[PDB]
Amino acid sequence: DIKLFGKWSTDDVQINDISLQDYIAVKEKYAKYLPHSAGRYAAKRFRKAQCPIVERLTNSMMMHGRNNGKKLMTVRIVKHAFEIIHLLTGENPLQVLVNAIINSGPREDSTRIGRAGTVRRQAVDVSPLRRVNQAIWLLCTGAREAAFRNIKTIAECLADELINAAKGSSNSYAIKKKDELERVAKSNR
Amino acid sequence: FTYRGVDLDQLLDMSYEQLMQLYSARQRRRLNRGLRRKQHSLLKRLRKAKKEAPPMEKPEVVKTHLRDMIILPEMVGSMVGVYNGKTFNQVEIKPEMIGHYLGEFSITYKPVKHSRFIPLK
Amino acid sequence: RRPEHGGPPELFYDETEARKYVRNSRMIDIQTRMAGRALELLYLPENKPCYLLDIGCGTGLSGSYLSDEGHYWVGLDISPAMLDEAVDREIEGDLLLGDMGQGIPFKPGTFDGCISISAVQWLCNANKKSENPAKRLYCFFASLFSVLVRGSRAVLQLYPENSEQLELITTQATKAGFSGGMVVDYPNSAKAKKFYLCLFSG
Amino acid sequence: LVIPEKFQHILRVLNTNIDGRRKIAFAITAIKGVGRRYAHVVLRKADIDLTKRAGELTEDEVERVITIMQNPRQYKIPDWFLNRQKDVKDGKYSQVLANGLDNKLREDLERLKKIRAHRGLRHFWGL
Amino acid sequence: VGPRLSRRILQQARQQQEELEAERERTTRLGP
Amino acid sequence: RNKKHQKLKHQKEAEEEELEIPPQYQAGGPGAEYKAKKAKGDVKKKGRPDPYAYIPLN
Amino acid sequence: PGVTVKDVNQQEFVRALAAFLKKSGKLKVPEWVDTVKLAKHKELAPYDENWFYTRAASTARHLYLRGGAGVGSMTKIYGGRQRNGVMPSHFSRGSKSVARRVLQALEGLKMVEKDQDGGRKLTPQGQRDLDRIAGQVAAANKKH
Amino acid sequence: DKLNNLVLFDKATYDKLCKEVPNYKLITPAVVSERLKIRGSLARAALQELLSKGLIKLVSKHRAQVIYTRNT
Amino acid sequence: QSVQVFGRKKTATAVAHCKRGNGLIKVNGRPLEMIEPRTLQYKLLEPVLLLGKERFAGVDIRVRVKGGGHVAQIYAIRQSISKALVAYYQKYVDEASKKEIKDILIQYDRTLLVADPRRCESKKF
RNA sequence: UGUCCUACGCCGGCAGGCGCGGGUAACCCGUUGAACCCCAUUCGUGAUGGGGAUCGGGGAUUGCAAUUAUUCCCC
């Protein structure tokens, strides 16, 4: 049985949203030992739907300059995050990861159009691929700008953000930004 | 006055070769590398200026272009004028001047000493 | 790339953005000398007490500059976080919470001068379907021409992202009766090119 | 462990205040004339536990470390490691710490002003 | 592969062959 | 290339204002002297105040 | 059958060899052991007070892995990154005198000897001691 | 505003640590430092001491992050 | 009986020699389980875990690795061990095991047997 | 890339100094023991062990000559 970090199973992982079964790739073919693969999942369109989702978090925590290219640090970060989220919650970390991804992707966006001076906003639907991408981006931004100047490490803030977006409580950053975006989309039908 | 715990009288009586250790590293390297003909030339000229002076007041002024002399204790009390590019600055060599170059005492550049529309209609 | 594209000012100017605004040295320095230029750009007479509006007050450092010069002022803003940190700054003048495009709630013949800092550019685009920038700008400019003393002056600082915003703002200003022009401070510069719409009632 | 009964929150050494709630090896650096390197070498010559905090040193420890920073050459702290190596007026190796640093600095400025070299004249023309 | 990488691979394999095959003064006089 | 970019961005701004003017008249009733020839910037003069621009409103 | 140095964890091996050379107590400790930085790119003195035994243990291991290393080679080995102020960083070597004193102390313990073609290399008896301490590391780790 | 984290054990702080830390379900230096208002280095020292007395279970060790939790 | 194969990455090369043995894995003379980055340790260990230690119990391999960086060297090593086992079970063991094992590697990861031909681009004046 | 690149030995804490070899070069520097990275220690939200500007003292080196700081090193 292929296990994340040698101790995390993907067989009991159940994805709830119908919209994203092809776009959250973590199952018996997408189960990997490690979120490092040196994969060329971006040489052709829609290839990144075949990327395992922990590798997508690992690729999306290498941000703001100093951390670019440092992937082993990020594999370490998500590993320690999985241990601490399992200790704090008491169940499979990957399940609340996919839960926070599903509950963090916005379902209705706003586009800005304009002709000359008059600039207005029209509400439009979202692709499932953009749903997963925006959920990953918002969770990474939430953890990153959550810590940045405090005693709490990056892994603890990532796990707390991942819990707080998994259950959907309003103290999470990602669910707040998603609710703001859905509100402006509802106001700009 | 004293310089590194040494008084001027025996400083004049000290040798050329073991005065070298009393100075800083730049001066010691310069004294390692010898002095040129103009150096002893102006040394002889300032000595001649000191010799022909009446013993009550300061000797005459000796002027030069040569800015990279190190002030030695021989020169203490002399009346030296150094070209700063346009004019000559005349300065008395004090005992406190014992380590520096002459060119520090005639600066070759001058200090730099360096309304809104309101609508009526 | 720009704050305007974030959305409505009630959502881009939340608590976190307010706390990054109050702890920002460049904001303090630039907006302070903009308040200086704004107060010097209307020819209100020297040694004469005057009453001013400071709209788009946000932190009230523009209000702190007005109170530094001895003058009293009324602050108007749309974001609650800006007014919260402004009262936390212990500013001298009185604040008020309300949208400027809906209209300024003051009686006519009131203020000796008006100063607006980085706020009129937000009325050039519509972030709601009920919103219409042309009528909103017309209402806001007519409210200026109402609540101001006839013959007073209003300086309106902005950083227009293109000339369409200037076109619409100037058209809605000239159709509200306002006479004046544009002081483009350091016109051909880039880091100091600041647009000041200067207006008066006759 | 727990706070000692003689934990000193504020220390008064060399006419200068010391914040006692810090590691000793940087509470030493809190005054002028000593940085991190000289503090570490002083503490290693003095045979003091650098893991220990500053506020729990006894009077014997503070008096011996003050003694060592006044006369470092006596305690085999080398000549090259010192602040003032050759004083211009009286050639000797020392380590000016609290007020002597300011003294030698301002008298060097007055010396450069009296001789009218470029450096002193430019420095006093800078203000 | 290309010249450079194949050259490095070939010399590396040759050195591995010699170190697998791996696991006194010069003859100063002519006649014993 | 960025030169022509900036230059005719300004030219479009001027043309848009000049085409705003006639319907403004109907429905109702710039640093060239401060431009430096040697460089991009803004050079002070003594006869006139600090560099500025006045575009009056009709 | 005997485990070598190359058969164990290197950090535990270095720490155990440091404990070995400390309990031997016959290395010539320099008089300036507590007042030097190990290279010009350092910012502080080494935080571990008996750093000399650790450095000598690592030096012995490095000569075991690759013979013919002089003082210059060991300064290249322990070189790092100098942060040149507000200027870009660079690679800087170690301090030559520390490496020389470690090598001469190891020769004084007769663990290390010269060769005809260059720098220092391991003695057979020191190599036996190194295999012994490597076996001690393997027993203390792999059998635990 | 300015945090005033304690550099050393107070008596009440030490007692509260000894009888409230061993039931948290998550033991890291950061959580003890933030919810006890103590300096994080001494938080690490206290966690190491609690591990040394055989009362708290270590989960994973790193130079970057160390995590402990309850025995039972 | 023995074979010698190679794997590669950007510049990292690994040359693997595969001989009859008892199940000890050497890379640069050092054991497989002690290569410096532990965070990529399972990336080093995937062929053994997918195939089982029983398929390695009657064979030994030694790999010399030159070039590249840490991660590139690890990827070249895992390509080398996979190609070495495939070549050995092709040449001296029956072909059916070689084909099923090759299928297992290529369904898990193509880069275990096919080189990634990505390198740094050149800059032209 | 190299008749200034440099191995190695000795001295000094460091820049550096002395001697003795190789290289007109896939032959020697060089199996170019690079840095990020990886593993342990200290640090704990503090203009603080972040950040290094600007200065004070001394040493060394290239030059006919370093003053208006050539460059480097230590505090």
Ligand SMILES: Nc1ncnc2c1ncn2[C@@H]1O[C@H](CSCC[C@H](N)C(=O)O)[C@@H](O)[C@H]1O
């Ligand atoms: N339509 C509108 N009505 C009222 N206030 C508005 C507004 N659009 C923008 N604003 C206000 O414009 C401000 C921009 S920030 C200005 C801060 C101020 N110049 C200072 O630095 O002191 C915000 O406080 C925002 O709430």
